[PDB]
RNA sequence: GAAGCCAGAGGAAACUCUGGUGGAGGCUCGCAGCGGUUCUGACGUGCAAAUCGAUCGUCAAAUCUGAGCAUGGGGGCGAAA
RNA sequence: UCGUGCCCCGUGUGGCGAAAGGGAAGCCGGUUAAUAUUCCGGCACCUGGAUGUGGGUUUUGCGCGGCAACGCAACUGAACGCGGAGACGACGGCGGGGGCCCCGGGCAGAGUUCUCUUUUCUUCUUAACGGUCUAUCACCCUGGAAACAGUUUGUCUGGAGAUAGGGUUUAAUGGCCGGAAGAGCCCGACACUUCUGUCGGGUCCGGUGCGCUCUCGACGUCCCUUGAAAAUCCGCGGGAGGGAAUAAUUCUCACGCCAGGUCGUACUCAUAACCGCAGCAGGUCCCCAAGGUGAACAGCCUCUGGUUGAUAGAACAAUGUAGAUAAGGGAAGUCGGCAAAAUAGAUCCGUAACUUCGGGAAAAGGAUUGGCUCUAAGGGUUGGUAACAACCAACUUAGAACUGGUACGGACAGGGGGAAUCUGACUGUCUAAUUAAAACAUAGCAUUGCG
């Protein structure tokens, strides 16, 4: 996790206040990762991720 | 000696003249027991219609407006009414018969 | 139109079974429709779905049979199946008047009605079993009082 | 079970994602002779031996 | 009346019907035109992700089976 | 959670900068009011009666601390 | 219904009798569980390479049972077939 | 500067091995198509670290009080030692508490209504975490008891200090309060293409118990059986060092700051998700367990929750499988009463031989059992011959009258009994898949070897 925030950190520059992961049934991990209240999720995802 | 004061609101089914007012004064009057005995209203209760369909009650007793209702379905239901009038409480002591919903078909 | 999933939200969300709940049969299409638990209670606000109350089980029977074994009914050689200990246990007997008896024996030594000596021999009388009940201890006290004021 | 480790699940992920019929443009190949997977798994037919 | 394996569902659950009203009030002898029972009987980013929650649960993103092959003969 | 009894150390818990908002519950059957201030550990409540006692503590208490009044319904 | 305990009537005492209390026993009827006595039983290419029905034994313990571990064939284990 | 040297302790010196043993700490509400004590909202706790504020102590340096049990929010504690917790069997009854079950009144809703039924049913809830007031045992003070007393269902306690009077304390799943009504639930009136909801009223007051289940506690019984260990935590002995008014603090006191890594989490757990070649009437370890009859988690019926799945339709021959009946005789049948029938619950009268005196024994043999209306007996609390009044409550036991009858444990459930002989002491065990037994084992007895 501390990797995980890490990394986001370095590349998008993303804080964030926690970080919860699971490996799934088919072997890779997935990482939710909870923003600050101060930036929005809907915008990040928007402009840097491309998730509109 | 304490009082309650319970209304028995019939005013749309009395205007729309399917609910006999008198007839439910009567019926309320022979069948309200007082003592597990019909015909003992005496000094404890009193019936009246104080107008516009609707019916007064007075108790000295610790009757209640459970029996009221319960008696009020009775009538509704010697005169085939149970199937489309509701007698809903609508405030303390307030029981209004009225229209179950009715859809257009 | 296939409605188990429809059911099983409408149950989950009711927070009844399965078998209570009561999905409209001439709105089978706007309810087939919903794939949400969303949909499933906007659907129960419009009274498309709705919970069917608890089947009847009253208890009228059980409690006009129990006014009946209180009165004295039903109660006969043909009633009875278990043993008289079974039915009611001698030690539960023996234990019930032992603390009727006791209580009644401290009840009176702190009224002053006895004094301690002749307390203590009430207390080992009772528990050698003399005294039947109340009365047969009151009436033990009464004719030792009796006596003592013969006596003196 | 519920309670299982990392390498068993691990064994059980890529057993799950060997679990698939083969895609369709393997048929189409030039010289090709796979027109099925033999080696096809299922749940109730053969256990994974683990 | 089936009270011993169900209960009956409640008048307040069920709309009744107006036809029926209507015959069962003139059975028993009421004015229903008089009293007028017609009347009375009844009768942007977010959306862009909002759109896609819609596909997604609606028509799935790959096809393992049938992405390797385009052309429909 | 925590209930104070004294006025005058309810007004020192909502002095303190870990104290981030203040909320009123008015109880209207019960003919009472609570003064609801949340810290970092504890959640301190303190009970009155509808009066002008708590009238006046509502100004007594902080300026910069938030205040609000708990609506009659919790909407998620 | 075993000790222990209480009361009464005796007996010089030691002891005797009566009425209670007490809740012990590799005791007992019997539900579950465990086991497998009997039926011209069912079944006999069976539901089953040992199952089903009724009946039966036991059921507070030498009772039943899970997991971890140990004993490995010239062997082990065996209330001993 | 230290990354180099100097001391001290040296009895001792590894790892693996339990998703049911030991163990730091999270509850409620809501949310998904599928996850939730993990997400969201609210409200907390534990561990480790850093670090201030307030308060406490201090020139009588490391607190004060009560006879005391021991309290109060703080109260320096090194090496070396002591003690406690972790840390414990099985069984029997008794008492308290939580939950479930049962009864009554009240609000709202639903059902019934030829007739009767002030009726029947449904919601009426309060978590973790804290504060406050109480609750077995035990301990502390006055005082010294035979005419012995106190006391339990159960006979134990007391001059090694009882009764009584007065207190301190481990122990709540108890009362009140915060959490917290703002939640959840029930009802009503509007709005409502959807998006979406909005606003009102409540969520109250009692009683009962040889009831079921869990937990706690004081007891008592059994052993030639005496019913784990370690990690970890705490207290005490001791006083080594450290300690100030410049202000200090080696304050386990309140408040405030930071962080908490890895792995598992779906679903089934079985007449279809495991094994048996199978979607096989087999087998496979546990938790929760409503109402009525009844002694009863016996058999039968019902509520919540689940199913309605195991090829169907028609006809009703023989022979079958399973269930029954049968006039008269009652084992004449058969190798053989095989099978079936008969007995059966409960109350009362009564019960022989033999015997290891414990048993036999439910021996044997008899009388009765429905319904209705009554009678009598068996209790609790409060209050200066109180042997009296008021209030409240539940299940048993016995007696009487009336009455229906072919029946009265009306279904269900449920010993046939006896006279003997052989045999093994008994309880127990084995030939899984033909033999459960006079076989094996058992306690008792006897012999041999070993310092």
Redesign the interface.
């Known amino acids: 996790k501390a990797q995980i925030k890490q990394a986001l950190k370095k590349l998008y520059d993303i804080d964030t206040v926690k970080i919860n992961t699971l490996i799934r049934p088919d072997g890779t991990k997935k990482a939710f990762a909870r923003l600050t209240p101060d930036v929005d999720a809907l915008d990040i995802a928007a402009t840097k991720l491309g998730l509109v | 000696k304490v009082t309650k004061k319970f209304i028995i609101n019939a005013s749309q089914p009395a205007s729309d003249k399917i609910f006999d007012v008198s007839a439910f004064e009567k019926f309320l009057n022979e069948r309200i027991k007082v003592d597990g005995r019909v015909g003992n209203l005496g000094d404890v209760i009193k019936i009246s219609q104080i107008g516009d369909g609707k019916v007064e009650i007075i108790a000295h007793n610790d009757l209640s407006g459970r029996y009221l209702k319960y008696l009020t379905k009775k009538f509704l239901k010697k005169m085939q009414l149970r199937d489309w009038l509701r007698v809903v409480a609508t405030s303390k002591g307030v029981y209004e018969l009225k229209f179950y919903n009715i859809v257009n078909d | 139109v296939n409605l188990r999933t429809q059911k099983r939200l409408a149950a989950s969300v009711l927070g009844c079974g399965e078998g209570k709940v009561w999905l409209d049969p001439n709105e089978v299409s706007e309810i087939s429709n919903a794939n949400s638990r969303q949909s499933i209670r906007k659907l129960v606000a419009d009274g498309l779905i709705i919970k069917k109350p608890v089947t009847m089980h009253s208890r009228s029977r059980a409690r006009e049979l129990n006014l009946a074994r209180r009165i004295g009914r039903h109660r006969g050689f043909g009633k009875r199946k278990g043993t008289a200990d079974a039915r009611m246990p001698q030690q539960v007997l023996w234990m019930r008047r032992q603390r009727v008896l006791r209580r009644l024996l401290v009840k009176y030594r702190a009224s002053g009605k006895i004094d301690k000596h002749l307390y203590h021999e009430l207390y080992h009388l009772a528990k050698g079993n003399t005294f039947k009940h109340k009365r047969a201890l009151v009436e033990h006290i009464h004719r030792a009082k009796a006596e003592k004021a013969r006596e003196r | 079970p519920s309670h299982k480790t990392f390498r068993i ?2 064994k ?3 057993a ?2 060997q679990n ?2 083969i ?4 048929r ?1 190949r030039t010289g090709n002779t796979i027109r099925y997977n033999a080696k096809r798994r299922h749940w109730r037919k053969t256990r994974l031996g683990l | 009346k089936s009270l011993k394996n169900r209960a009956i569902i409640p008048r307040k659950a069920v709309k009744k019907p107006l036809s029926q009203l209507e015959d069962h009030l003139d059975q028993l002898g009421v004015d229903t035109e008089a009293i007028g029972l017609r009347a009375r009987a009844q009768t942007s980013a977010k959306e862009r992700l909002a759109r896609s929650r819609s596909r997604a649960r609606s028509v799935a993103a790959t096809n393992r089976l049938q992405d390797g092959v385009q052309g429909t003969t | 959670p925590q209930e104070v009894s004294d006025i005058k150390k309810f007004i020192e818990i909502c002095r303190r900068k870990d104290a981030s908002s203040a909320r009123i519950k008015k109880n209207p059957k019960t003919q009472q009011i609570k003064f609801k201030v949340r810290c970092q550990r504890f959640l301190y409540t303190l009970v009155l009666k509808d009066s002008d006692k708590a009238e006046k503590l509502k100004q007594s208490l902080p300026p910069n601390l938030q205040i609000k009044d708990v609506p009659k319904r919790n909407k998620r």
């Open positions: 699940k691990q059980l992920a890529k799950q994602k698939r019929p895609p369709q443009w393997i189409l």
